[PDB]
Scaffold this active site. Structure first.
Site, short mmCIF file in Angstrom:
data_model
loop_
_atom_site.label_atom_id
_atom_site.label_comp_id
_atom_site.label_asym_id
_atom_site.label_seq_id
_atom_site.Cartn_x
_atom_site.Cartn_y
_atom_site.Cartn_z
N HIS A 135 -6.02 2.65 6.79
CA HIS A 135 -5.99 1.44 5.99
C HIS A 135 -5.41 0.47 7.00
O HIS A 135 -4.62 0.89 7.87
CB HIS A 135 -4.96 1.47 4.85
CG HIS A 135 -5.29 2.42 3.75
ND1 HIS A 135 -5.01 3.76 3.82
CD2 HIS A 135 -5.88 2.22 2.55
CE1 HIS A 135 -5.40 4.35 2.71
NE2 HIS A 135 -5.94 3.44 1.92
N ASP B 262 -1.76 0.92 7.49
CA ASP B 262 -1.26 2.18 8.07
C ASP B 262 -1.09 1.98 9.56
O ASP B 262 -0.24 2.61 10.20
CB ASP B 262 -2.23 3.36 7.92
CG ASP B 262 -2.49 3.74 6.49
OD1 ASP B 262 -1.56 3.69 5.67
OD2 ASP B 262 -3.64 4.12 6.20
N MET C 157 -14.43 5.78 9.83
CA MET C 157 -14.24 5.02 8.60
C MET C 157 -12.91 4.29 8.60
O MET C 157 -11.92 4.77 9.16
CB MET C 157 -14.34 5.99 7.41
CG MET C 157 -14.17 5.37 6.02
SD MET C 157 -12.46 5.11 5.50
CE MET C 157 -12.08 6.70 4.78
N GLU D 106 -15.16 3.89 -3.67
CA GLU D 106 -14.49 5.12 -4.08
C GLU D 106 -14.02 5.01 -5.52
O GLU D 106 -13.08 4.26 -5.82
CB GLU D 106 -13.29 5.38 -3.19
CG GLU D 106 -12.64 6.70 -3.50
CD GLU D 106 -11.58 7.04 -2.53
OE1 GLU D 106 -11.66 6.57 -1.38
OE2 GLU D 106 -10.67 7.81 -2.90
N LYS E 203 -12.27 6.23 -9.21
CA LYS E 203 -11.10 6.99 -9.66
C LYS E 203 -10.91 6.55 -11.09
O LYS E 203 -11.03 5.37 -11.39
CB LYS E 203 -9.86 6.69 -8.82
CG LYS E 203 -8.69 7.62 -9.15
CD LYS E 203 -7.49 7.35 -8.27
CE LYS E 203 -6.39 8.36 -8.51
NZ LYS E 203 -5.21 8.03 -7.69
N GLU F 145 -14.37 11.47 -4.44
CA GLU F 145 -13.28 12.35 -4.06
C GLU F 145 -13.22 13.49 -5.05
O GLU F 145 -13.24 13.25 -6.26
CB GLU F 145 -11.95 11.60 -4.06
CG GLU F 145 -10.78 12.51 -3.73
CD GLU F 145 -9.53 11.75 -3.43
OE1 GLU F 145 -9.60 10.87 -2.56
OE2 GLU F 145 -8.50 12.03 -4.05
N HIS G 112 -10.66 13.13 -7.91
CA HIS G 112 -10.87 12.00 -8.82
C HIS G 112 -11.84 12.33 -9.96
O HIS G 112 -11.57 12.02 -11.11
CB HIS G 112 -11.35 10.76 -8.07
CG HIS G 112 -10.34 10.22 -7.10
ND1 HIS G 112 -10.55 9.07 -6.38
CD2 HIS G 112 -9.12 10.68 -6.73
CE1 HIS G 112 -9.51 8.83 -5.61
NE2 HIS G 112 -8.62 9.80 -5.80
N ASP H 56 -14.58 12.33 0.20
CA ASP H 56 -13.16 12.66 0.33
C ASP H 56 -12.93 14.05 -0.24
O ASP H 56 -13.21 14.30 -1.41
CB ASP H 56 -12.29 11.65 -0.42
CG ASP H 56 -12.00 10.40 0.38
OD1 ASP H 56 -12.55 10.24 1.49
OD2 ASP H 56 -11.24 9.55 -0.11
N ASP I 276 -3.07 12.76 -10.05
CA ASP I 276 -3.85 13.03 -8.84
C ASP I 276 -2.95 13.82 -7.87
O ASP I 276 -1.99 13.28 -7.34
CB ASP I 276 -4.28 11.68 -8.25
CG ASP I 276 -5.35 11.80 -7.17
OD1 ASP I 276 -6.23 12.69 -7.26
OD2 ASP I 276 -5.32 10.96 -6.24
N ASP J 213 -3.88 15.68 -4.99
CA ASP J 213 -4.25 15.61 -3.58
C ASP J 213 -3.87 16.87 -2.83
O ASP J 213 -3.32 16.80 -1.73
CB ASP J 213 -3.64 14.40 -2.88
CG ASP J 213 -4.20 13.10 -3.40
OD1 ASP J 213 -5.40 13.06 -3.77
OD2 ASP J 213 -3.45 12.11 -3.42
N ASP K 40 -8.73 13.76 2.21
CA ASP K 40 -7.81 12.79 1.65
C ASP K 40 -6.87 13.62 0.81
O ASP K 40 -7.11 13.86 -0.37
CB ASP K 40 -8.52 11.75 0.80
CG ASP K 40 -7.63 10.59 0.46
OD1 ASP K 40 -6.42 10.69 0.70
OD2 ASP K 40 -8.14 9.58 -0.06
O1 LIG Z 1 -6.04 8.18 -4.88
C1 LIG Z 1 -5.93 7.49 -3.65
C2 LIG Z 1 -7.30 7.27 -2.98
O2 LIG Z 1 -7.95 8.52 -2.81
C3 LIG Z 1 -7.15 6.59 -1.60
O3 LIG Z 1 -6.48 7.50 -0.72
C4 LIG Z 1 -8.51 6.17 -0.99
O4 LIG Z 1 -9.28 7.29 -0.59
C5 LIG Z 1 -8.34 5.27 0.24
O5 LIG Z 1 -7.42 4.22 -0.05
C6 LIG Z 1 -9.71 4.68 0.65
O6 LIG Z 1 -10.16 5.24 1.89
NI NI Z 2 -9.61 9.10 -1.50
NI NI Z 3 -6.70 11.51 -5.07
NI NI Z 4 -7.31 10.10 -4.13
#
Ligand SMILES: OC[C@@H](O)[C@@H](O)[C@H](O)[C@@H](O)CO
Ligand code: NI
Ligand code: NI
Ligand code: NI
Ligand SMILES: OC[C@@H](O)[C@@H](O)[C@H](O)[C@@H](O)CO
Ligand SMILES: OC[C@@H](O)[C@@H](O)[C@H](O)[C@@H](O)CO
Ligand SMILES: OC[C@@H](O)[C@@H](O)[C@H](O)[C@@H](O)CO
Ligand code: NI
Ligand code: NI
Ligand code: NI
Ligand code: NI
Ligand code: NI
Ligand code: NI
Ligand code: NI
Ligand code: NI
Ligand code: NI
Lengths: 388, 388, 388, 388
Positions: free
Chosen positions: A54, A57, A88, A181, A183, A217, A220, A245, A255, A257, A287
Site C-alpha cells: 500500500h 506501507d 501489484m 477486492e 469484502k 480473497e 472474505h 488473495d 476476518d 487472515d 494476504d
Molecule cells: O481485509 C483486508 C484486505 O484483505 C486488504 O488487506 C486488501 O487485500 C488490501 O488492502 C488490497 O491489496
Molecule cells: Ni486482501
Molecule cells: Ni481478510
Molecule cells: Ni482481507
C-alpha cells in the site's frame, strides 16, 4: 518429497502481511515494525517471487517529497539485490481518520477528491516499479446504520471514481489494470460491493469495463458463508480474475487472515484444483497475518507454510485429475455430459423433439444415481494421500 | 389509525405460501391441502391484489391435457369472480426426483432439455393469464461436493438455457420479462448465483440482457448475512429490480420464510423506505410460510400480518423522510454532498486542484463528526412512534 | 495401507441414516424405503458394530401390540444372524403433527403426558434389546416467536420430564443412562438447550444428575459456529460424554448431515485426536444422510466413507502424537506447563511470591513467542501425509 | 411522552465505552482520550446511575503506588460530586502483550500467576469503591489452532484460578460475587466458555458455586446466532444472572458493540420484557462503542440513545402484558398450561392414566392450532405503537 517453492511458482506477499505488528482491537502490538527492506530479503530467502504494498506501507504518511525519494530508492535497491518483483500495488484509503466514512464514497466531497489524488499519486509509483495490477479494497466504503448512506448515490460516486482512474491510466498510456477486492463487512458494519458477484456486476456499468477485474480473497467470501471456489469459477467464466488473495478463515466471524491451508482445508484443495486446471497465470498472493502469539521466527514459519500448503494441494489435485479411476468416476457422474451443449440443435428442434418432453421417461431418469459420494471419497483419499 | 390494504397496494401471494401444508424435513403435514380457488377467494377478502404460481401448484404433475384445461378454467373463473390478477408465474424445477441434480444445470443432458420444455410450456400459460414477469429460482442448481459440478460448464449451461428462453419469448412476440431469484444454499449445499450480485453479473453475459432482471428475497440475502436494502439499492441502480419477494428471516440458518416484518425489523423499515423512495411500482409479493404450528385461522392471520406490517413501515418511513428535523440531520451528516459529483470539473481540473491534495487540511476534515448516531436515533424514534 | 473397519472399532449407524429416503423441504423422496432387516445385514457386511433406532423407525406409528411383536422379532433375528448390537435407542417426538409445538415442553399438557408415555414405552424396548444409552433430541422444543414460549416454564417442564424418566429407570432397576442431544435450530426457529454448554448446565439441575450425559453432534455445534473439539473437551472434563454423533457440516446454514470427514476436515482431525487421546470407549455413531442425489449403491459408499475417514484420521492423529519432532514442538509451545498447576503452593504463598508480581518481568515474558504456527504446520503435514 | 432516565433506572456504563477512541484493526483513533472524571460528570448529566471500570482504564498500566493513589482520589472525588455509584469492576487481562496467549489459561505458568495477582489487586480496589460484582471476561483464553491448547488442561487452570479468587474473597470477608462473561470468538479464533451455557456448566464444577454467576452480553450470544432472551431465561432459571451487558449486534460477524436498541430490535423487546417480568434488579449496564465516525457530541448522543431505547421498550413490553386482548391470546396459545405441572399426580398415576396414551386422541390434539401468529402480531403492534 519436495515442496520447496521457487520464484517460478509466482508466490507473493504484501509488506503488511509478514509486517503485521499484532495490534488488534483489544491489544497492543506484540512485534516491532519490520523495515520493508528486511521483509524483501527474508521473503526472497524463502522462495517468494515478489511483494506488494500500500502506499502507506512503503512511504510513511505525511512524508516529504525528499523522504519519499529515499524510501523508494532503498526499496528499489532491495528488489535489485534479490531479483524480487512488484506485480501489484494498492492504496491505503482506510487507516487515517480522514477516511472514517470512506474514501471514494465518503459523504464529504473534499475527502472523495483527496482519496482520488492519493490514489493517482500511487498509481504513478506502481507503474514505475513495474506493477501490472492495481488493487482497490474499499474497506471504509459502507455504513453501520441505514440512513447514513444512500447506496444508489454511493454507487454513483464509486463509479465516478473508477471511471476517472480509468481515464487517467489511458491518458498516460499506462499498461496497468484495476482489480476490485470485495469484502462483506469489517471494519464497516456492511461494506459496499460485499462479494465477488456484486463487484463483477458493478464493473459492467463502468465506462471502460475491459480495464477492471476482481481480486477475491478466500476469507472474505467465507465471511458470507459462500463457496470460494464457486465464486472464483464465476470470475474466470467472465474473464475477470486478474489477481487473487490467498489465506484461511474459520467460518463466519471476524476476518482471521490465517495462513493459506488453514481454515477450510477442503475448499483450499478445490481452489487449487480450479486455479491449476483453468491455467490461472497471475500471482499467488498471500494476504494473511501471522497470529500475534508469534515472535519473528513464527512469522517466517507461517509465511513458509502458505507456500508449502499450496504446493502440497497442487500435487494432490494433480494426482486426483490424472487418476484413471477418477476419470472413470467423472464419467459415471456425467461431468462429460455437463460440458456438452443442451441444445446445439436449436430452439425449434428442441420444441419438436418428442424425446425431450412428450416421450421423456422421467421415472427412469430420476432413478439414475449421480454417484457423487464415491467421487467425493476418491477426492478425499487423494487429498489425504490414502489411495489404496 | 388505518392499515387496511386494498388491491391498489399491489400485495400478492404465491399459491404455495398460504397453501404450505407444514411438511418440513422432520415432520408430516399439519394442514390439509388448499384448493387454489379457495386461496384466491380468501386472499381477495384480505385485500390482496393478486396471486402467483408454479406450474405444479396449479396443475398437478402428470396431468393430462384435458385435466389441465379443467384446472385452468376453474382458476380463471375464480380470478374473474374476485378481480384478482396474476402478475408473475414460475416453474417448479425442484420437487420431482428427476431434478435432484438440477434442471438447467443437471449433469444429465436429457434432464436439461426436459427442464427447458417444462418451462416453455408454462411460459405460454403465464402469458395467457396476463403475467408480466416470469421468475426462475434454480433451487436444485448447485452441489454438496466439489467434484460433482464444474461451475464454468454449469454457467455455460445456465446461460444456454436462459438465452433459449429469450429466443422463444421474442419469436412468439410475448410481452414478458424474466427475473432470476438468487439463494445461497438450501436445498443444495451451495446454489449457483448465490446472491443478488452474482445474478446481476451473470445477466450481463446473456445475449439479450434487457429481458432479464432479478427477483431478490429478503430471507435469501440474509442467509449470507448480507444487508438486504443495500442489495436492493444495487439492483435498482442497475435498473434490474423487476420483482421482489418479501418475508422475514432470523439471521444465518435455514430459510425460515417468516411473515414480512418478522425477523430483522429494522432492515424491513429500511427496505420499505427505499422501495417507496425509489418509486418501485412492481408487486409487493410475499413468499412466506405460515408456521406449521398454525391451523387455517392462523394462516390467514399470518398473511394479513404481512400486509399490515408493510403498511405500518410505509407510514413510519414516510414520517421519517418528511420530518424537518430529519431533513436537517441528513444535511448535518452530508447526505446532500454524497449526491453531488466528486469531480464534474473533470480529471485535469482535479489534478491541478491544490485544495484537493497539496493544500488539503486532512486533520480538520478528520475531526468533523458524521453525526450518524443522532440521525439513526431519529430513525429509531420514528419506527417506534416515539417522536417527542 | 489398510483402513478396513471391524466390529471392534465400535462404529454404529442409526436406521434412519442409511434409510433416509431423500425427502427434503423442497422435494419428494428419491429412494424407496429400506426394511430395517436389510439395513442390518448391509451394515454388518461393511464392518459396522451395531445400529440404533427411534421407536418409529422400527415399529410404524399406530402399530397394534401384535404387529409390534412381529417387527421386533424380525429385527431381533437379523441381530442374531449378524452379531450386530444395539447400543443406543431414542424416541421420535418430532415427526407426528401432535408434536408440532414440542413433546416434553409442548404448551398443551395432554401432549406432554403423551410424550412421556411414548418415551417410557420405548425405554422398556431399549433395555430388552440391550441398549446402554437412551438419547433424547428435543427437536420440536422451542419456538419461532418470542411470546409463544415462556422459557423458564419450559425449562421447568423439561426438568420435570427428565426427572420422571429418571424415577422410572431407577424404580425398574434398569442399567441405562440418558444422553441429551443439543441443536441450536431447525426445525424450530430456536431450540431449547441449543449447545453442549446449555445441555451440561441443565443436567446439573436434575434430581439425579449422575444418570444424564450429553450426545453432541459435530454438525449441530457447527451450526452455531462453535468449535466442536472444544465442546467435546468440556463434556469430557465434566465426565458427561456418554455418546457422540459423527457427521459433516459446511458452516452456518441448514443441518446438512454430510458423511463424517466431509465438511470441516481439520476439525474432524482434532476431534479424532481428542477422542482417542482421552480414551473415549463409547460407540462412534454416525448420524448422517446420504445425499438425495444418490441411489442405493451411493448410500452404502457414503456409509463406508464415514468409517474410512475416521480410520484415516485416527492413524494420522496417532502419527502426529508419536512424532518426536511434534513432542519437541509441544514443549516449545509450553503445553507441558499448561498441565502443571498454577499455584499448588497455595493462595498465601502466591500472595507473598514477589516473582509473581512485584518482580515479574512482563516485557521479557511478553517477548516469548508461542511457536504455535510451527506446531500447527506439523499437524497439517501429518494430516496430509506430507512429513519430510 | 417522557423517556428521561433517572438514577433509579440503574443504567450504568463502562469507562471504556464512551471513552473508546475509535482505534480498530484497520485504523487509528478518531477521538482523543477522555479523562475518567469527565466521563463521570457527563454520564451523570445524562441520567446514568453509575460507571464500571477495568483496572487499566482507571490507573494507567505500570503506575507507581503513588500515581495510583492520585488517580483513585480524583475518581473518588468525581463520584462524590455527582452521586454516581460503581456497582461493578473487572480486570484487563487482554491488552498487554504478556496476555497474548491468555491470562488464567496462558500456557506459561508465570503468566498465569501474574494474571491472578493483577486480578486480586483490583478486587481490593473494587471493594473499596463499593462494587458488588466483579466481572471476568477471558478474552484471550482460547486459541487459533488445535494443538496450541489442550482444553481439558485449560479448564483445570481456569477452575484453579476461579477457586483461588473465591478463597481470597472469603478469607478477606468481602461482600462481592463473581460474574463470568462468555464470548464465542474475537480476539481469539475460539474463546473458552463460548456461550452462557458453557459458562453456567463450568460454574457447577467450582468449589464454591454460590459465589459465581454469569454476565451475558447481547452481542456475544448473537455472534453464535443464539437467541439472547432464551439464554437469559436459562440463566435466571438457574438463579445465576448476576449482571448483564446491553448492546446491539447485526448478526454473525465481528463484535460491533452498537448502542442498545440497534441491531436486532425485536430481540431487544423480548429481552426487556423478560428482565422486567422476572424482576431483575441488577444494573442495566451498557457495554457499547460509539462508532468511530462520531465526534464527542455523537458519543453522548449514542450513550443517551442506549437509555432511551431501553425505556421505550420497557413501556411497550408493559403495555403488551397489560393488554386484555394479549392476556386472552396467551390463554388461546396455552401459555397458562405450559406453567402447570405435567404430572404433579406422580409417575405411577401417569403410567395408569389411560387418557395419556391408550385412549389419547392424537389426531384431535394435532388439529389444534397454536394461534402463535396472532399472538406475535399483537406483540408487533405493541412494539410499533400501532394498536387499533
Ligand atoms: O481485509 C483486508 C484486505 O484483505 C486488504 O488487506 C486488501 O487485500 C488490501 O488492502 C488490497 O491489496
Ligand atoms: Ni486482501
Ligand atoms: Ni481478510
Ligand atoms: Ni482481507
Ligand atoms: O426458497 C424458496 C424460493 O423462495 C421459492 O419460493 C421461489 O421464490 C419460487 O419458486 C419462485 O417464484
Ligand atoms: O438433527 C437431527 C438429530 O441429529 C437426530 O437425528 C438425533 O440424533 C436423533 O433423533 C436422536 O438419536
Ligand atoms: O467484547 C469485549 C467484552 O464485552 C468486554 O468489554 C467485557 O465486557 C469487559 O472486559 C468485562 O467487564
Ligand atoms: Ni425463499
Ligand atoms: Ni426463502
Ligand atoms: Ni422466493
Ligand atoms: Ni442432526
Ligand atoms: Ni444434524
Ligand atoms: Ni444426531
Ligand atoms: Ni463485548
Ligand atoms: Ni461485545
Ligand atoms: Ni461486555
Amino acid at each position: 518429497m519436495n515442496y520447496q517453492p521457487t520464484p517460478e511458482d509466482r508466490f507473493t506477499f504484501g509488506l503488511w502481511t509478514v509486517g503485521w505488528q499484532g495490534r488488534d482491537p483489544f491489544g497492543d502490538a506484540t512485534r516491532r515494525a519490520l523495515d520493508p527492506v528486511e521483509s524483501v530479503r527474508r521473503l526472497a530467502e524463502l522462495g517468494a517471487h515478489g511483494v506488494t504494498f500500500h502506499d502507506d506501507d512503503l512511504i510513511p504518511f505525511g512524508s516529504s517529497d525528499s523522504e519519499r525519494e529515499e524510501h523508494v530508492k532503498r526499496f528499489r535497491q532491495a528488489l535489485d539485490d534479490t531479483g524480487m518483483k512488484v506485480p501489484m500495488a494498492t492504496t491505503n484509503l482506510f487507516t487515517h481518520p480522514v477516511f472514517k466514512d470512506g474514501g471514494f464514497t465518503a459523504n464529504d466531497r473534499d475527502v472523495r477528491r483527496y482519496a482520488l489524488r492519493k490514489t493517482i499519486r500511487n498509481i504513478d509509483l506502481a507503474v514505475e516499479l513495474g506493477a501490472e495490477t492495481y488493487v482497490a479494497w474499499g474497506g471504509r466504503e459502507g455504513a453501520e446504520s441505514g440512513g447514513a448512506k444512500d447506496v444508489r448515490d454511493a454507487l454513483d460516486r464509486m463509479k465516478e471514481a473508477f471511471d476517472l482512474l480509468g481515464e487517467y491510466v489511458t491518458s498516460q498510456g499506462y499498461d496497468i489494470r484495476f482489480a476490485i477486492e470485495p469484502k462483506p463487512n469489517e471494519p464497516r458494519g456492511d461494506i459496499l460491493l460485499p462479494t465477488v458477484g456484486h463487484a463483477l456486476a458493478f464493473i459492467e456499468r463502468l465506462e471502460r469495463p475491459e480495464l477492471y477485474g476482481v481480486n477475491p480473497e478466500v476469507g472474505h467470501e467465507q465471511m458470507a458463508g459462500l463457496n470460494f471456489p464457486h465464486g472464483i469459477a464465476q470470475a474466470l467464466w467472465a474473464g475477470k480474475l486478474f489477481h487473487i488473495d490467498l489465506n484461511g478463515q474459520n467460518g463466519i466471524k471476524y476476518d482471521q487472515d490465517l495462513r493459506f491451508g488453514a481454515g477450510d482445508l477442503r475448499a483450499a484443495f478445490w481452489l487449487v484444483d480450479l486455479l491449476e486446471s483453468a491455467g490461472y497465470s497471475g500471482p499467488r498472493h498471500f494476504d494473511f497475518k501471522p497470529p500475534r502469539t508469534e515472535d519473528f521466527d513464527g512469522v517466517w514459519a507461517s509465511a513458509a507454510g502458505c507456500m508449502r500448503n499450496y504446493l502440497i494441494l497442487k500435487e494432490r489435485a494433480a494426482a486426483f485429475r490424472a487418476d484413471p479411476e477418477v476419470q472413470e468416476a467423472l464419467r459415471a457422474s456425467r461431468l462429460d455430459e455437463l460440458a456438452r451443449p443442451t441444445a446445439a440443435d436449436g430452439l425449434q428442434a428442441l420444441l419438436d423433439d418428442r424425446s425431450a418432453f412428450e416421450e421423456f421417461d422421467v421415472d427412469a431418469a430420476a432413478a439414475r444415481g449421480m454417484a457423487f459420494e464415491r467421487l467425493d471419497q476418491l477426492a478425499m483419499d487423494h487429498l489425504l494421500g490414502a489411495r489404496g
